[PDB]
Ligand binder design. Sequence first.
Ligand SMILES: CNCCOc1ccc([C@@H]2c3ccc(O)cc3CC3(CC3)N2C(=O)c2ccccc2)cc1
Ligand SMILES: CNCCOc1ccc([C@@H]2c3ccc(O)cc3CC3(CC3)N2C(=O)c2ccccc2)cc1
Lengths: 226, 238
Amino acid sequence: LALSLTADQMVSALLDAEPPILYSESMMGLLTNLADRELVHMINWAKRVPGFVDLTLHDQVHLLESAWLEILMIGLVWRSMEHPGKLLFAPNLLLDRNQGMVEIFDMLLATSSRFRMMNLQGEEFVCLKSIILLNSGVYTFTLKSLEEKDHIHRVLDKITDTLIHLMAKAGLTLQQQHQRLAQLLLILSHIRHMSNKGMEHLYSMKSKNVVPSYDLLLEMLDAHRL
Amino acid sequence: LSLTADQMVSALLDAEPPILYSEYDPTRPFSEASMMGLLTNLADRELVHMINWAKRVPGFVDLTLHDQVHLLESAWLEILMIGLVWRSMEHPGKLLFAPNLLLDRNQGKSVEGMVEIFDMLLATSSRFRMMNLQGEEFVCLKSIILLNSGVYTFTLKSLEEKDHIHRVLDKITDTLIHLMAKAGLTLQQQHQRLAQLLLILSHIRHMSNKGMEHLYSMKSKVPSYDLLLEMLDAHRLH
Ligand SMILES: CNCCOc1ccc([C@@H]2c3ccc(O)cc3CC3(CC3)N2C(=O)c2ccccc2)cc1
Ligand SMILES: CNCCOc1ccc([C@@H]2c3ccc(O)cc3CC3(CC3)N2C(=O)c2ccccc2)cc1
């Protein structure tokens, strides 16, 4: 029944689901602590993305495993759009590139500058986040699994429809619509690249719970009791 | 920037590199021990053609040589992989590295970390199959990889280059949409398919980063920036 929402309904649901902005509480201890607290809010947000909770819990966890760092990154880029040259990790934690860290830092700044140049809108941003959640694990998962992937692709199609709808209501021509859609989805591959480097770094720590476990994510999802 | 969509597709089709073979060296028969050497030599020969292909992607040679090399340094493995996936599309469960080098997953299990990447490639091939990806779409996607993968990791000249690259990417988008419009897809089907194709590029980037990790774990003597520049920096004496 999530696949029966109108585009306007999809947008409203996604705007209403947005997580709060957290505050920060060693720069790296601070950033780890912030990320760890944001994760919980991200899960609550994921559960409100239309179509997401129709998946099995097992598949919801896999999608969160694959997507969470990309989702933290795109949130950071969004918060940082109005702060050229700086990254707004939290309202009390604005860092510039002077504060292997600088490479990712510079890439995030470039992404934030690209969003600024494009005049990325909030309604577009929340569609892009939902695409990351559904797309980032869809290629790295039986009859049941195939049905799940099929559902994922149907939801992704509806989000594409919603993005085009937003662009059309903003007065873009059909050409500008498809050009903008393409520009936004190409940025997602850069966001994937940044996440890949950060995940490589986390795994290299060989430290039990630095990468959120399946069990931790599952606990956060707070499964029904029946 | 002046080309029509039809002329863009024709240029990209005309620029396509050939399908290369693995060596037929009777002194070097295929085995698990020789496999990496055969695959490295194949990749090395493909890279030479890839350089000459890139120079034929409309808009690419308008860039500085320095920026051309950066784009190739950032894209070459993705381009090698998407070509592999394309060659494998019609062979479920196999990777067609060359017509005489068709491997299955159990042959992948020879090396550490190789089967994981192998399965990601197979999944991409399966997705191409499900979408019934067309050759004209494939050549558009490969050019997008070339222009997009390095554009976010690059002065007034740099601003002009990035503007140019974004204009060329926009023309390839127009070209992809035109291919689907000519075929008869509805507008809704056109936007849905464009998005489906472009989302696959995130997966290809992911695979490229895993593959880079794997190649570096080989501890052999990856094309360097200096090496790619030597290859792209052609003279005009021919
Ligand atoms: C999950 N438990 C284990 C910790 O994983 C962590 C996850 C994220 C981060 C932060 C963080 C925090 C909040 C945010 O909203 C976004 C980010 C982004 C990020 C990865 C880019 N990061 C950094 O520090 C960073 C690194 C190098 C260059 C610039 C920034 C820290 C640790
Ligand atoms: C570039 N200079 C030095 C060469 O580095 C090389 C570049 C490419 C490869 C092959 C190769 C060859 C041709 C092709 O078209 C594609 C590929 C794909 C690939 C990169 C993923 N590869 C592997 O073996 C591999 C590994 C794990 C899983 C599956 C495949 C070997 C070495």
